[PDB]
Amino acid sequence: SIRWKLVSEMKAENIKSFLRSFTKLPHLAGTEQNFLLAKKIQTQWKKFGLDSAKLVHYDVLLSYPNETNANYISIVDEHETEIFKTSPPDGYENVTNIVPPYNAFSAQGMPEGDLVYVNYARTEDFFKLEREMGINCTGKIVIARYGKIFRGNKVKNAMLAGAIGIILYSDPADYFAPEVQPYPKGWNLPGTAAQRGNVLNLNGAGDPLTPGYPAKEYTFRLDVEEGVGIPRIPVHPIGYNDAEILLRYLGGIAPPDKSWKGALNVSYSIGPGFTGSSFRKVRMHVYNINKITRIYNVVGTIRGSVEPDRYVILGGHRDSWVFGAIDPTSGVAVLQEIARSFGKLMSKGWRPRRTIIFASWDAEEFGLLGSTEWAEENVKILQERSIAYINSDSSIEGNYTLRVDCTPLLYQLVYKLTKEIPSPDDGFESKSLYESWLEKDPSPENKNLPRINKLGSGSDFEAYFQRLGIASGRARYTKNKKTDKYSSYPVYHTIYETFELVEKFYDPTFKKQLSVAQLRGALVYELVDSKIIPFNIQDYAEALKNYAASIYNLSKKHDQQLTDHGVSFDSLFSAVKNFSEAASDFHKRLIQVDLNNPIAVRMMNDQLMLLERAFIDPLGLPGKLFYRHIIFAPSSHNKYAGESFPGIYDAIFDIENKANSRLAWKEVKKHISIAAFTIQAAAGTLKEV
Amino acid sequence: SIRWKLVSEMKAENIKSFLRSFTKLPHLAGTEQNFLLAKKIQTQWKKFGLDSAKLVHYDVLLSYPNETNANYISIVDEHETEIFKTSPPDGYENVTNIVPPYNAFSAQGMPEGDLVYVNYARTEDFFKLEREMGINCTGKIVIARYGKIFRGNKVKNAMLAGAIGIILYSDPADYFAPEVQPYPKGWNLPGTAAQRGNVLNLNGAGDPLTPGYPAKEYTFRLDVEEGVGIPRIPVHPIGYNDAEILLRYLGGIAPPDKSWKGALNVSYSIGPGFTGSSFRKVRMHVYNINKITRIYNVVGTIRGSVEPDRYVILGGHRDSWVFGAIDPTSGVAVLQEIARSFGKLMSKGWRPRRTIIFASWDAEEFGLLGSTEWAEENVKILQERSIAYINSDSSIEGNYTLRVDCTPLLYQLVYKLTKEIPSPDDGFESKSLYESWLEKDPSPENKNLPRINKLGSGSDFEAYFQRLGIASGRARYTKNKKTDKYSSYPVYHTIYETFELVEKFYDPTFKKQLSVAQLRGALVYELVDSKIIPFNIQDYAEALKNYAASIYNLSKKHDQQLTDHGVSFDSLFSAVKNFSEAASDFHKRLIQVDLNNPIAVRMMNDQLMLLERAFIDPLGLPGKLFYRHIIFAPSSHNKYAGESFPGIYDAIFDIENKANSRLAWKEVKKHISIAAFTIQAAAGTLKEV
Numbered sequence A, B: 001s002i003r004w005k006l007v008s009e010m011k012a013e014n015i016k017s018f019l020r021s022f023t024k025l026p027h028l029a030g031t032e033q034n035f036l037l038a039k040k041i042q043t044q045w046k047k048f049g050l051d052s053a054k055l056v057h058y059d060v061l062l063s064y065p066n067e068t069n070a071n072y073i074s075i076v077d078e079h080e081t082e083i084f085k086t087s088p089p090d091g092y093e094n095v096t097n098i099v100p101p102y103n104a105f106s107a108q109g110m111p112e113g114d115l116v117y118v119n120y121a122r123t124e125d126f127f128k129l130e131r132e133m134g135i136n137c138t139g140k141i142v143i144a145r146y147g148k149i150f151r152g153n154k155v156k157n158a159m160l161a162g163a164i165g166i167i168l169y170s171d172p173a174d175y176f177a178p179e180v181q182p183y184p185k186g187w188n189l190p191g192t193a194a195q196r197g198n199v200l201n202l203n204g205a206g207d208p209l210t211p212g213y214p215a216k217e218y219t220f221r222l223d224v225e226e227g228v229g230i231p232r233i234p235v236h237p238i239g240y241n242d243a244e245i246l247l248r249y250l251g252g253i254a255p256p257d258k259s260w261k262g263a264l265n266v267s268y269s270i271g272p273g274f275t276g277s278s279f280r281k282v283r284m285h286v287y288n289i290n291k292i293t294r295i296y297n298v299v300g301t302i303r304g305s306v307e308p309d310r311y312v313i314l315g316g317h318r319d320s321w322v323f324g325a326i327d328p329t330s331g332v333a334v335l336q337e338i339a340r341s342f343g344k345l346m347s348k349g350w351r352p353r354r355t356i357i358f359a360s361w362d363a364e365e366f367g368l369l370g371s372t373e374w375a376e377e378n379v380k381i382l383q384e385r386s387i388a389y390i391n392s393d394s395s396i397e398g399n400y401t402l403r404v405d406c407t408p409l410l411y412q413l414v415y416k417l418t419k420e421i422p423s424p425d426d427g428f429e430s431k432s433l434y435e436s437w438l439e440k441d442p443s444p445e446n447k448n449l450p451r452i453n454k455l456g457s458g459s460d461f462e463a464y465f466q467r468l469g470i471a472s473g474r475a476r477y478t479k480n481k482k483t484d485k486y487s488s489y490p491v492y493h494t495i496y497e498t499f500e501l502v503e504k505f506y507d508p509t510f511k512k513q514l515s516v517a518q519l520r521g522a523l524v525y526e527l528v529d530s531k532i533i534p535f536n537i538q539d540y541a542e543a544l545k546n547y548a549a550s551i552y553n554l555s556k557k558h559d560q561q562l563t564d565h566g567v568s569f570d571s572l573f574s575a576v577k578n579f580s581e582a583a584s585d586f587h588k589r590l591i592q593v594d595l596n597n598p599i600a601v602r603m604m605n606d607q608l609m610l611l612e613r614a615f616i617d618p619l620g621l622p623g624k625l626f627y628r629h630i631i632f633a634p635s636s637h638n639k640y641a642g643e644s645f646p647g648i649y650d651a652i653f654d655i656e657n658k659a660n661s662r663l664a665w666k667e668v669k670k671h672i673s674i675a676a677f678t679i680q681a682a683a684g685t686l687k688e689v
């Protein structure tokens, strides 16, 4: 078949050569090297035979360290004397433009104060410090370990607590894998390395200065002081050797339980302040600059021969913090190999039914900026014509098995294609990827099917799925979560994401990265070429039954209040019931369609394409204009995680502590009512008359 | 042709019999008689052969007088003694349930104070009273004449001024036609009759308690105190005999110029207070009740044989204040005759290409409630599938010539169809409606084409056009505006809108109402049956060039400020230029389409259908979530009137008096930027690749 030719044409050795070619130098967004990489990708796409490959630019707010006012953290004594102050991988000694560690969009400042350790700086950590312990963060400098929630939420949480700065660091408890050596001898995080990353709280907005509209040359911009999601205290990241020095002499209360204690050789006392030392106060000095900077997406097409006005988007970012060998360059290499293989199909006369859009996004590391501004530019065509979005970010975050996150519309297609891709796993040489994946990660809901996760947030699919309602999917290799308990991967967002890391320690044969390229490519092919779009709406109906039961279960602890405030989930369950009926009836009709009647086929394809759109509410969620998906929009507590019925969940979260209960419960009623309506409206789009 | 059979089948005598049958008794929304009328319409549609005809209900906030606490206005002396107090057409003496005059959704109260005459209670009238004259309305009762702006805006304006009540009345200057007798001898307004009407400021929201979502049984409702657009002072309407008594002894400043002086035999002095009288203070007593009440739309279909998933909506309200012989029942009768004529086509085996939706809306007089709640329910299917909406409200507001208001997409179709409909005008017996209309109302932009107006607001097309972006149109007979200078028509919204009025004084032969039914029906037929949707996008391009020039001209008075604040219209003109190019290229391609290739035809039809949608911004306009059309959304000063580039216009209005100029001009820049983007995005939907 054509799909087998697409998949079998891709080669591990090609992914390896692409990765090596794109990881020799840093390619930070907004810098010359990442523009040069765009031009190289565009030349390659033209060579592969794509119909177009253009650079599309935007001018967006980025953030960089000041090369002549370096950031640092220090400890001073009571006489203001500096007692301690903070200060390339082998083979890259000659590389001159590695950005030092920083947290993009930090406020500027030189705050000084007593230090308080805040664990993960989650909402519950601050609740505990303030409510239980009676500790006052006003005004203190807090130190938090990375993990559990997106780093921007840690900063927002610290701001809410009156902290005047926040230090972030990587605890070996969370980022150091047991019995593996630190880079370069193994793949673990060294004590000298800090994790870069932006600290905006954008909630899907894109460029901070132009929420809702693409950042073109003429475009109105907010004043920088009003930029969406920009924090108002300094934030800076350090490695664990430096963190150990800061934590060592914290006094005050002992860590409250083992869940506060990391792995360094220190007490994990909370503070505030020091005991047993010259160590008296902590200072931060952070002076990164925000500047409007041009960024460049590469956007290419293969136009459909039958439905050129219907799109499947294969999009991945290419900007990195340093070399980004895993994040994102492993996905950049995969995207090139996919485009090469579609070009080989074209060379023998194939053209797809619908149009494929290839996209290499810029400035993802600064808040999904390139992918979001292109969605904002092209919203009117994208919302009326897009079948799906398949991401192409990191392909290789571990080497145990496949992970897939996607809308329930795509579950059946994912299971179908993974059965036709050879497994790359040792011991599965005559078996498919489906078989190895089912063995290694069975679904809790059905032991006979592999696990597929919800799509949440934190990579370029976000605006397409959570704002525009375009069915989306991602797939990558990952770690074994039952045994591997560290966050992300050890060298995430550090200078040590190198080609050598990936080749030596992750996937020496490149077979695992090949399997991810084959699946992302086969997903695009089947969505763009199948006469009938390969979605299954009954799988959405079953997902909604699970999510309704879950939010309802969460409400049982408040059962008396539900009764007293006249709160009922009846309408939600009724909508779910009606959706399941409409989806069953829709599939009964769909098998009867006359495949030789183009308008009959196109009307049913429109219903499959527009089903995800029905869940988008243009009013958004409370305080979040750009999160519109009523089933799947984000975790308010961790942007990386997806949350179901977010309007209901946010309304009921910590409700027992809301000042005004009558008001709080009416908000729960509001969001229940919205979810019921939206699911009923979605069911209505499936009806025949 | 089929269109000629549709048009020639309609009969004046049938419209007359329908009108007489629907105007014997009052049919106020929410009352038994208007439910009975729904059932009669539904029985008729089934008899005519429609595929379906169903009642669709919602439970919405309505407002009625308290039958046991009657409203009134009084004058008292300084001893609190009542000196004056306010208190059926021939042949209707036995009709028992005529609602007395009131303004629906008025606050309740018994305010007492000095009286101030405020002309039309426009923003500029209050500016003059307060800024120029130094008059303080705090706290006064104001009296305003109806006209110039929607009555709800008069009330909002008075509230802003600190007034504690507002009396509305019909001045003969505005509602009494020269040399015609008062009903029953002629068609003029008697001094005893008051104009009913709601006084909400909904800005497109629909039911006040459920903005954004249909008002079903389970639906979350705002507390009534928080109902959208509900005014916070009492409001009540009186006839001019009563107004004369209230105005007569006003003292204080003389009317400032003739534009403040109406036609009664009084001075039109402003007050505050009385001079020359027992007349000391004015009191209002208003105790209407707001109550959630069930309303019923009748919704019927004729399903398409080729594109059943594409819709053309013919919708008109049927609820009236009393008999509503003009408003809306003349349109109710027209809608029935149209449905009858489509049923006759069906009887000979015809079926339309696309689906026609017929709708008889309820509670239009209470804020467009039935049509808006059905749009809110069905938004997901309507926005993805609707070709157009044709209204069917009053057909006969005068007897001089045709008036058409529609999107520029429909201009060419309107001109084409009116050439094939016989003129009903005396002296035009062998001529078409186009010819009589061109002679009587030529367009200012092109003397060789008849005038077509912008669609604004104030009838059931509003949510479809201004929220959802569905191309809309309306047509009716009207007065000669160069000679007839009165507002609306004299007996508008009074008890004197009777069948006898229409038959004796407006259209005895029913030929004018017939011509309106033929045009509304022919519009539906051509939109639903033509293989290629009959829109012209180059007419939209020319309209945008006119609107860009107009808003720019308006800015010239502020030219120095534009320069000082770096405000430019360059991007707007550039977007308009690009749209005109894209529309020209689109039509060049459209004439080449292979009419025998269904997918080629369907892709171009999708572009014609979705063009109006491109102008809808889900973020809305400032303070108005439900006005989304960036070119055509409303006048903030008069909901009946449409305003172009409303975001730019509202931003620049009264700007010289804004407290903060730097902030005010940035808002102008914002709205210019949004308009430029939106027109460019719309152009992008027309592009081939």
Ligand SMILES: *[C@@H]1O[C@H](CO)[C@@H](O[C@@H]2O[C@H](CO)[C@@H](O)[C@H](O)[C@H]2NC(C)=O)[C@H](O)[C@H]1NC(C)=O
Pocket: A571, A572, A574, A575, A578, A676, A677, A680, B216, B217, B218
């Ligand atoms: C699910 O569909 C059912 C059937 O159409 C709806 O049930 C109606 O519910 C209302 C109360 O909300 C009752 O007045 C009707 O009697 C019900 N009809 C039947 C046949 O049971 C139900 O409302 C729909 N659910 C939602 C959320 O719209």
Ligand SMILES: *[C@@H]1O[C@H](CO)[C@@H](O[C@@H]2O[C@H](CO)[C@@H](O)[C@H](O)[C@H]2NC(C)=O)[C@H](O)[C@H]1NC(C)=O
Pocket: A216, A217, A218, B571, B572, B574, B575, B578, B676, B677, B680
């Ligand atoms: C109208 O289309 C033109 C042509 O594509 C756009 O012109 C570009 O404008 C930007 C400045 O905004 C310049 O950087 C480019 O050099 C222009 N190109 C050309 C060929 O003139 C214009 O931006 C579009 N208008 C809008 C509002 O999008």
Ligand SMILES: *[C@@H]1O[C@H](CO)[C@@H](O)[C@H](O)[C@H]1NC(C)=O
Pocket: A066, A067, A068, A069, A289
């Ligand atoms: C970088 O820091 C130096 C030293 O404070 C300062 O003078 C310079 O202006 C900074 N650069 C920018 C863009 O702020």
Ligand SMILES: *[C@@H]1O[C@H](CO)[C@@H](O)[C@H](O)[C@H]1NC(C)=O
Pocket: A187, A398, A399, A505, A506
């Ligand atoms: C890769 O797989 C090998 C072989 O099982 C294992 O020893 C190693 O820890 C894995 N590497 C990573 C980064 O997980």
Ligand SMILES: *[C@@H]1O[C@H](CO)[C@@H](O)[C@H](O)[C@H]1NC(C)=O
Pocket: B066, B067, B068, B069, B289
């Ligand atoms: C009507 O007014 C009477 C007299 O004030 C009052 O008692 C009654 O409750 C009112 N009806 C309603 C629904 O308020």
Ligand SMILES: *[C@@H]1O[C@H](CO)[C@@H](O)[C@H](O)[C@H]1NC(C)=O
Pocket: B187, B398, B399, B505, B506
């Ligand atoms: C209707 O037309 C007649 C004949 O021209 C005219 O005398 C009369 O004023 C018109 N009626 C109305 C209500 O305008």
Ligand SMILES: *[C@H]1O[C@H](CO)[C@@H](O)[C@H](O)[C@H]1NC(C)=O
Pocket: A136, A137, A138, A139
């Ligand atoms: C800590 O919190 C309280 C209440 O927020 C605040 O009044 C106080 O100023 C804070 N502490 C200090 C030391 O200022």
Ligand SMILES: *[C@H]1O[C@H](CO)[C@@H](O)[C@H](O)[C@H]1NC(C)=O
Pocket: B136, B137, B138, B139
């Ligand atoms: C009229 O306006 C001023 C300013 O709004 C207000 O202070 C005053 O109270 C008002 N007049 C009266 C009589 O209260």
Ligand SMILES: [Ca+2]
Pocket: A205, A206, A207, A209, A210, A211, A212, A213, A214, A215, A373, A376
């Ligand atoms: Ca933007």
Ligand SMILES: [Ca+2]
Pocket: B205, B206, B207, B209, B210, B211, B212, B213, B214, B215, B373, B376
């Ligand atoms: Ca509503």
Ligand SMILES: [Cl-]
Pocket: A331, A391, A392, A393, A394, A459, A474, A475, A476
């Ligand atoms: Cl990915």
Ligand SMILES: [Cl-]
Pocket: B331, B391, B392, B393, B394, B459, B474, B475, B476
């Ligand atoms: Cl109308």
Ligand SMILES: [Zn+2]
Pocket: A317, A327, A328, A364, A393, A394, A459
């Ligand atoms: Zn990434």
Ligand SMILES: [Zn+2]
Pocket: A327, A365, A493
């Ligand atoms: Zn990253």
Ligand SMILES: [Zn+2]
Pocket: B317, B327, B328, B364, B393, B394, B459
């Ligand atoms: Zn009307």
Ligand SMILES: [Zn+2]
Pocket: B327, B365, B493
């Ligand atoms: Zn009316």
